[PDB]
Protein backbone atom coordinates (compact mmCIF):
# COMPACT_ATOMS: atom_id res chain seq x y z
CA UNK A 1 0.00 0.00 0.00
CA UNK A 2 3.10 2.20 -0.24
CA UNK A 3 4.25 4.35 -3.30
CA UNK A 4 8.32 4.78 -3.47
CA UNK A 5 8.85 7.38 -6.13
CA UNK A 6 6.36 10.45 -6.78
CA UNK A 7 7.30 13.37 -9.30
CA UNK A 8 3.74 16.15 -10.04
CA UNK A 9 4.90 19.30 -10.46
CA UNK A 10 8.00 20.75 -12.16
CA UNK A 11 7.57 24.52 -13.89
CA UNK A 12 10.65 25.92 -16.12
CA UNK A 13 8.87 28.75 -17.62
CA UNK A 14 10.38 31.68 -20.35
CA UNK A 15 9.16 34.46 -22.07
CA UNK A 16 9.91 36.12 -25.33
CA UNK A 17 13.54 34.69 -25.28
CA UNK A 18 15.23 36.28 -27.95
CA UNK A 19 19.53 34.27 -28.52
CA UNK A 20 22.08 33.37 -30.46
CA UNK A 21 24.18 30.51 -30.19
CA UNK A 22 27.44 30.01 -32.21
CA UNK A 23 30.33 27.48 -30.66
CA UNK A 24 33.00 25.27 -32.34
CA UNK A 25 32.84 22.13 -31.74
CA UNK A 26 29.90 20.59 -29.25
CA UNK A 27 26.39 20.04 -29.53
CA UNK A 28 23.47 22.62 -29.08
CA UNK A 29 20.19 21.80 -27.20
CA UNK A 30 17.37 23.99 -27.02
CA UNK A 31 14.98 22.46 -24.76
CA UNK A 32 15.72 19.73 -22.50
CA UNK A 33 13.32 17.51 -20.78
CA UNK A 34 14.01 13.97 -19.75
CA UNK A 35 13.46 11.26 -17.21
CA UNK A 36 15.89 8.39 -16.49
CA UNK A 37 13.47 6.63 -13.41
CA UNK A 38 16.24 3.53 -12.95
CA UNK A 39 13.85 1.89 -10.33
CA UNK A 40 15.12 -1.61 -9.23
CA UNK A 41 13.36 -3.84 -6.51
CA UNK B 1 -0.46 -3.05 -3.60
CA UNK B 2 2.48 -0.71 -4.24
CA UNK B 3 3.24 1.45 -6.87
CA UNK B 4 7.29 1.91 -7.28
CA UNK B 5 8.09 4.51 -10.11
CA UNK B 6 5.97 6.85 -10.97
CA UNK B 7 5.93 10.38 -12.65
CA UNK B 8 3.23 12.84 -13.15
CA UNK B 9 3.88 16.19 -14.24
CA UNK B 10 6.63 17.83 -15.78
CA UNK B 11 6.66 21.30 -17.61
CA UNK B 12 8.70 23.20 -19.91
CA UNK B 13 7.15 26.12 -21.13
CA UNK B 14 8.43 28.93 -23.85
CA UNK B 15 7.17 31.43 -25.87
CA UNK B 16 8.10 33.78 -28.49
CA UNK B 17 11.70 32.22 -28.91
CA UNK B 18 13.28 33.79 -32.23
CA UNK B 19 16.73 32.00 -32.18
CA UNK B 20 20.01 31.67 -34.76
CA UNK B 21 22.25 28.51 -34.15
CA UNK B 22 25.63 27.92 -35.69
CA UNK B 23 28.05 25.59 -34.84
CA UNK B 24 31.26 23.99 -36.58
CA UNK B 25 30.89 20.29 -35.83
CA UNK B 26 28.05 18.61 -33.17
CA UNK B 27 24.75 18.43 -33.32
CA UNK B 28 21.93 21.15 -33.00
CA UNK B 29 18.90 19.80 -31.19
CA UNK B 30 16.04 21.80 -30.69
CA UNK B 31 13.28 19.88 -28.69
CA UNK B 32 14.04 17.26 -26.07
CA UNK B 33 11.22 14.66 -24.77
CA UNK B 34 13.04 11.39 -23.68
CA UNK B 35 12.21 8.25 -21.42
CA UNK B 36 14.48 5.54 -20.37
CA UNK B 37 12.47 4.22 -17.82
CA UNK B 38 15.38 0.67 -16.78
CA UNK B 39 12.82 -0.92 -14.25
CA UNK B 40 14.64 -4.58 -13.28
CA UNK B 41 12.55 -6.57 -11.36
CA UNK C 1 0.79 3.42 3.80
CA UNK C 2 3.42 5.14 3.35
CA UNK C 3 5.34 7.86 0.78
CA UNK C 4 9.21 7.55 0.17
CA UNK C 5 10.30 10.25 -2.49
CA UNK C 6 7.76 13.08 -3.23
CA UNK C 7 8.13 16.25 -5.46
CA UNK C 8 5.76 18.38 -5.86
CA UNK C 9 6.59 22.13 -6.44
CA UNK C 10 9.32 23.40 -7.96
CA UNK C 11 9.65 26.80 -9.94
CA UNK C 12 12.08 28.37 -12.98
CA UNK C 13 10.45 31.62 -14.28
CA UNK C 14 12.62 34.41 -16.48
CA UNK C 15 11.06 37.23 -18.30
CA UNK C 16 12.41 38.86 -21.55
CA UNK C 17 15.12 37.26 -22.14
CA UNK C 18 17.54 38.22 -24.81
CA UNK C 19 21.03 37.03 -25.08
CA UNK C 20 24.37 35.43 -27.07
CA UNK C 21 26.36 32.36 -26.23
CA UNK C 22 29.66 32.16 -28.10
CA UNK C 23 32.29 29.34 -26.62
CA UNK C 24 34.88 27.52 -28.36
CA UNK C 25 34.13 24.36 -27.68
CA UNK C 26 31.84 22.68 -25.17
CA UNK C 27 28.32 22.59 -25.85
CA UNK C 28 25.10 24.98 -25.18
CA UNK C 29 22.28 24.25 -23.64
CA UNK C 30 19.78 26.56 -23.05
CA UNK C 31 16.55 24.70 -20.93
CA UNK C 32 17.22 22.33 -18.37
CA UNK C 33 14.49 19.89 -16.59
CA UNK C 34 15.72 16.54 -15.91
CA UNK C 35 14.75 13.87 -13.47
CA UNK C 36 16.76 10.70 -12.47
CA UNK C 37 14.59 9.39 -9.73
CA UNK C 38 16.74 6.11 -9.12
CA UNK C 39 14.82 4.64 -6.38
CA UNK C 40 16.07 1.24 -5.07
CA UNK C 41 14.36 -1.12 -2.92
CA UNK D 1 1.58 6.84 7.28
CA UNK D 2 4.58 8.30 7.00
CA UNK D 3 6.21 10.51 4.79
CA UNK D 4 9.82 10.69 4.01
CA UNK D 5 11.39 13.28 1.43
CA UNK D 6 8.68 16.37 0.14
CA UNK D 7 9.46 19.52 -1.58
CA UNK D 8 6.59 22.14 -2.39
CA UNK D 9 7.83 24.80 -3.04
CA UNK D 10 11.05 26.72 -4.51
CA UNK D 11 11.40 30.04 -6.63
CA UNK D 12 13.83 31.14 -8.84
CA UNK D 13 12.46 34.52 -10.46
CA UNK D 14 14.50 37.06 -12.96
CA UNK D 15 13.02 39.51 -15.27
CA UNK D 16 14.10 41.67 -18.15
CA UNK D 17 17.86 39.90 -18.38
CA UNK D 18 19.86 40.80 -21.37
CA UNK D 19 23.16 39.31 -21.08
CA UNK D 20 26.17 38.49 -23.29
CA UNK D 21 27.83 34.95 -22.41
CA UNK D 22 31.73 34.57 -24.11
CA UNK D 23 33.64 31.38 -22.90
CA UNK D 24 37.10 29.55 -24.57
CA UNK D 25 36.01 25.90 -23.53
CA UNK D 26 33.81 24.65 -21.02
CA UNK D 27 29.83 24.50 -21.85
CA UNK D 28 26.98 27.42 -21.47
CA UNK D 29 24.17 26.55 -19.47
CA UNK D 30 21.13 29.55 -19.41
CA UNK D 31 18.30 27.67 -17.20
CA UNK D 32 18.91 25.07 -15.04
CA UNK D 33 15.96 22.51 -13.41
CA UNK D 34 16.90 19.54 -12.09
CA UNK D 35 16.00 16.02 -9.81
CA UNK D 36 18.32 13.59 -8.83
CA UNK D 37 15.84 12.06 -6.11
CA UNK D 38 17.43 9.06 -5.03
CA UNK D 39 15.59 7.61 -2.22
CA UNK D 40 16.80 3.94 -1.05
CA UNK D 41 14.94 1.80 1.26
CA UNK E 1 1.82 9.40 11.22
CA UNK E 2 5.49 11.34 10.98
CA UNK E 3 7.33 13.85 8.16
CA UNK E 4 10.98 13.51 7.93
CA UNK E 5 12.01 16.05 5.40
CA UNK E 6 9.63 19.35 4.68
CA UNK E 7 11.03 22.33 2.20
CA UNK E 8 8.32 24.64 1.36
CA UNK E 9 9.26 28.13 0.88
CA UNK E 10 12.49 29.14 -0.32
CA UNK E 11 12.81 32.49 -2.79
CA UNK E 12 15.23 33.91 -5.16
CA UNK E 13 13.98 37.30 -7.24
CA UNK E 14 16.27 39.47 -9.28
CA UNK E 15 14.52 42.24 -11.62
CA UNK E 16 15.76 44.01 -14.78
CA UNK E 17 19.10 42.16 -14.99
CA UNK E 18 21.37 42.94 -17.72
CA UNK E 19 25.01 41.39 -17.69
CA UNK E 20 27.99 40.28 -19.65
CA UNK E 21 30.18 37.32 -18.94
CA UNK E 22 33.30 36.22 -20.56
CA UNK E 23 35.33 33.91 -19.09
CA UNK E 24 38.39 31.89 -20.85
CA UNK E 25 37.41 28.01 -19.57
CA UNK E 26 35.02 26.68 -17.07
CA UNK E 27 30.82 26.85 -17.96
CA UNK E 28 28.92 29.42 -17.49
CA UNK E 29 25.37 28.70 -15.48
CA UNK E 30 22.72 31.90 -15.62
CA UNK E 31 20.00 29.58 -13.69
CA UNK E 32 20.33 27.47 -10.84
CA UNK E 33 17.72 25.59 -9.18
CA UNK E 34 18.49 21.36 -8.29
CA UNK E 35 17.44 18.72 -5.54
CA UNK E 36 19.41 16.11 -4.53
CA UNK E 37 16.93 14.54 -2.28
CA UNK E 38 18.87 11.52 -0.71
CA UNK E 39 16.17 9.83 1.65
CA UNK E 40 17.67 6.65 2.80
CA UNK E 41 15.52 4.05 4.91
CA UNK F 1 54.74 41.49 -47.44
CA UNK F 2 52.25 40.61 -44.23
CA UNK F 3 50.72 37.73 -42.58
CA UNK F 4 47.86 38.39 -40.54
CA UNK F 5 46.46 34.77 -39.26
CA UNK F 6 48.51 31.97 -38.70
CA UNK F 7 48.61 28.99 -36.69
CA UNK F 8 51.11 26.26 -37.06
CA UNK F 9 51.13 24.16 -34.02
CA UNK F 10 48.83 22.69 -31.45
CA UNK F 11 48.70 18.93 -29.72
CA UNK F 12 45.89 16.80 -28.66
CA UNK F 13 47.44 13.36 -27.04
CA UNK F 14 45.61 10.45 -25.46
CA UNK F 15 46.38 7.15 -24.79
CA UNK F 16 44.64 3.65 -24.14
CA UNK F 17 41.31 5.63 -23.48
CA UNK F 18 38.43 3.18 -22.79
CA UNK F 19 34.92 5.08 -21.96
CA UNK F 20 31.77 4.68 -21.80
CA UNK F 21 29.01 7.37 -22.65
CA UNK F 22 25.12 7.33 -21.60
CA UNK F 23 23.14 10.41 -21.95
CA UNK F 24 19.22 10.81 -22.02
CA UNK F 25 18.88 13.67 -24.28
CA UNK F 26 21.95 15.50 -26.25
CA UNK F 27 24.69 14.51 -28.37
CA UNK F 28 27.71 12.86 -27.82
CA UNK F 29 30.77 13.74 -29.99
CA UNK F 30 33.93 12.01 -29.35
CA UNK F 31 36.79 13.65 -31.62
CA UNK F 32 36.63 17.26 -32.22
CA UNK F 33 38.85 19.10 -34.68
CA UNK F 34 37.37 21.98 -36.51
CA UNK F 35 38.70 25.19 -37.93
CA UNK F 36 36.36 28.43 -38.19
CA UNK F 37 38.43 31.29 -39.82
CA UNK F 38 36.18 34.35 -40.51
CA UNK F 39 39.27 36.19 -42.27
CA UNK F 40 37.28 39.51 -43.53
CA UNK F 41 39.27 42.40 -45.40
CA UNK G 1 56.76 43.01 -43.02
CA UNK G 2 54.75 42.29 -39.89
CA UNK G 3 52.76 39.39 -38.36
CA UNK G 4 49.72 40.07 -36.10
CA UNK G 5 48.95 36.57 -34.92
CA UNK G 6 50.56 33.35 -34.12
CA UNK G 7 50.39 30.33 -32.61
CA UNK G 8 52.71 27.69 -32.31
CA UNK G 9 52.96 25.28 -29.36
CA UNK G 10 50.11 24.15 -27.52
CA UNK G 11 50.31 20.90 -25.77
CA UNK G 12 47.31 18.86 -24.02
CA UNK G 13 48.40 15.31 -23.08
CA UNK G 14 46.91 12.66 -21.00
CA UNK G 15 47.43 9.39 -20.58
CA UNK G 16 45.79 5.83 -19.84
CA UNK G 17 42.68 7.51 -19.10
CA UNK G 18 39.56 5.30 -18.20
CA UNK G 19 36.39 7.13 -17.63
CA UNK G 20 32.39 7.05 -17.24
CA UNK G 21 30.69 9.92 -18.22
CA UNK G 22 26.60 9.88 -17.10
CA UNK G 23 24.38 12.84 -17.96
CA UNK G 24 20.89 13.01 -17.83
CA UNK G 25 20.56 15.92 -20.99
CA UNK G 26 23.15 18.15 -22.10
CA UNK G 27 25.89 16.77 -24.42
CA UNK G 28 29.13 14.57 -24.06
CA UNK G 29 32.09 15.83 -25.65
CA UNK G 30 35.48 14.06 -25.29
CA UNK G 31 38.14 15.75 -27.45
CA UNK G 32 38.31 19.37 -28.36
CA UNK G 33 40.34 20.92 -30.63
CA UNK G 34 38.72 24.25 -32.25
CA UNK G 35 40.39 27.68 -33.81
CA UNK G 36 37.62 30.69 -34.45
CA UNK G 37 41.01 33.05 -36.12
CA UNK G 38 38.38 35.68 -36.58
CA UNK G 39 41.24 38.26 -38.12
CA UNK G 40 39.60 41.26 -39.54
CA UNK G 41 41.29 44.31 -41.60
CA UNK H 1 59.61 43.81 -38.98
CA UNK H 2 57.94 43.57 -36.11
CA UNK H 3 55.48 40.51 -33.99
CA UNK H 4 52.31 41.01 -32.47
CA UNK H 5 50.95 37.99 -30.78
CA UNK H 6 52.92 35.25 -30.27
CA UNK H 7 52.35 31.75 -28.60
CA UNK H 8 55.51 28.96 -28.49
CA UNK H 9 54.52 26.69 -25.26
CA UNK H 10 51.93 25.60 -23.06
CA UNK H 11 52.11 22.51 -21.31
CA UNK H 12 48.91 20.58 -19.91
CA UNK H 13 49.55 16.99 -18.42
CA UNK H 14 48.24 14.20 -16.75
CA UNK H 15 49.08 10.34 -15.70
CA UNK H 16 46.64 6.93 -15.22
CA UNK H 17 43.45 9.00 -14.63
CA UNK H 18 40.85 7.15 -14.01
CA UNK H 19 37.37 8.72 -13.35
CA UNK H 20 33.78 8.78 -13.04
CA UNK H 21 31.48 11.71 -14.05
CA UNK H 22 27.70 12.08 -13.28
CA UNK H 23 25.96 15.40 -13.81
CA UNK H 24 22.38 15.89 -13.61
CA UNK H 25 21.94 18.54 -16.39
CA UNK H 26 24.84 20.25 -17.73
CA UNK H 27 27.42 18.75 -20.43
CA UNK H 28 30.55 17.23 -20.49
CA UNK H 29 33.98 17.85 -21.71
CA UNK H 30 36.66 15.16 -21.17
CA UNK H 31 39.58 17.56 -23.26
CA UNK H 32 39.72 21.10 -24.19
CA UNK H 33 42.03 22.75 -26.26
CA UNK H 34 41.02 25.83 -27.74
CA UNK H 35 42.25 29.20 -29.93
CA UNK H 36 40.09 32.17 -30.50
CA UNK H 37 42.83 34.14 -32.02
CA UNK H 38 40.75 37.91 -32.51
CA UNK H 39 43.44 39.77 -34.11
CA UNK H 40 41.90 42.81 -35.69
CA UNK H 41 44.02 45.73 -37.80
CA UNK I 1 61.87 44.96 -34.32
CA UNK I 2 59.60 44.53 -31.22
CA UNK I 3 57.58 41.55 -30.31
CA UNK I 4 54.38 42.62 -28.12
CA UNK I 5 52.63 39.49 -26.66
CA UNK I 6 55.51 36.26 -25.97
CA UNK I 7 54.33 33.54 -23.73
CA UNK I 8 56.38 30.69 -23.94
CA UNK I 9 56.58 28.20 -20.38
CA UNK I 10 53.43 26.92 -19.03
CA UNK I 11 53.67 23.96 -16.56
CA UNK I 12 50.46 21.84 -15.01
CA UNK I 13 51.30 18.23 -14.43
CA UNK I 14 49.11 15.73 -12.12
CA UNK I 15 50.01 12.18 -11.28
CA UNK I 16 48.06 9.21 -10.75
CA UNK I 17 45.27 10.71 -10.56
CA UNK I 18 42.26 8.95 -9.45
CA UNK I 19 38.57 11.32 -8.71
CA UNK I 20 34.99 11.25 -9.02
CA UNK I 21 32.66 14.16 -10.01
CA UNK I 22 28.61 13.91 -9.54
CA UNK I 23 27.20 17.51 -9.59
CA UNK I 24 23.00 17.92 -9.75
CA UNK I 25 23.48 20.87 -12.85
CA UNK I 26 26.15 22.93 -14.17
CA UNK I 27 28.64 21.42 -16.53
CA UNK I 28 32.03 19.20 -15.62
CA UNK I 29 35.44 19.93 -17.42
CA UNK I 30 38.35 17.30 -16.92
CA UNK I 31 41.21 19.51 -19.06
CA UNK I 32 41.66 22.79 -20.02
CA UNK I 33 43.86 24.55 -22.45
CA UNK I 34 42.51 27.94 -23.68
CA UNK I 35 44.46 30.84 -25.45
CA UNK I 36 41.53 33.98 -26.50
CA UNK I 37 44.72 36.17 -28.13
CA UNK I 38 42.73 39.74 -28.52
CA UNK I 39 45.71 41.53 -30.17
CA UNK I 40 44.34 44.88 -31.79
CA UNK I 41 46.04 46.92 -33.76
CA UNK J 1 64.56 46.12 -30.42
CA UNK J 2 62.23 45.47 -27.02
CA UNK J 3 60.07 42.72 -25.42
CA UNK J 4 56.95 44.09 -23.64
CA UNK J 5 55.25 41.05 -22.42
CA UNK J 6 56.88 37.43 -21.83
CA UNK J 7 55.86 34.90 -20.22
CA UNK J 8 58.42 32.02 -19.60
CA UNK J 9 58.12 29.66 -16.39
CA UNK J 10 55.00 28.61 -14.23
CA UNK J 11 54.84 25.42 -12.61
CA UNK J 12 52.11 23.93 -11.16
CA UNK J 13 52.96 19.82 -9.90
CA UNK J 14 50.34 17.50 -8.27
CA UNK J 15 51.31 14.20 -7.46
CA UNK J 16 49.15 10.69 -6.44
CA UNK J 17 45.95 13.05 -6.08
CA UNK J 18 42.15 11.27 -5.24
CA UNK J 19 39.49 13.17 -4.71
CA UNK J 20 35.85 13.08 -4.80
CA UNK J 21 33.45 16.37 -5.63
CA UNK J 22 30.05 16.72 -5.09
CA UNK J 23 28.28 20.01 -5.58
CA UNK J 24 24.74 20.96 -6.07
CA UNK J 25 24.72 23.61 -8.89
CA UNK J 26 27.79 24.84 -10.10
CA UNK J 27 30.10 23.60 -12.44
CA UNK J 28 33.22 21.12 -11.74
CA UNK J 29 36.35 22.09 -13.06
CA UNK J 30 39.90 19.35 -12.64
CA UNK J 31 42.59 21.00 -14.59
CA UNK J 32 43.00 24.89 -15.61
CA UNK J 33 45.61 25.92 -18.11
CA UNK J 34 43.94 29.57 -19.90
CA UNK J 35 45.64 32.54 -21.21
CA UNK J 36 43.90 35.73 -22.67
CA UNK J 37 47.04 38.13 -24.02
CA UNK J 38 45.01 41.19 -24.39
CA UNK J 39 48.16 43.16 -26.53
CA UNK J 40 46.48 46.53 -27.66
CA UNK J 41 48.79 48.49 -29.33
Same mark, same amino acid.
Given at each position: K? $?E?? &?????? &??? $?? $?? *? @??? &????? &??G????? *?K? @??
Amino acid at each position: KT $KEGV &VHGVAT &VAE $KT $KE *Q @VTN &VGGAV &VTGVTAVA *QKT @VE
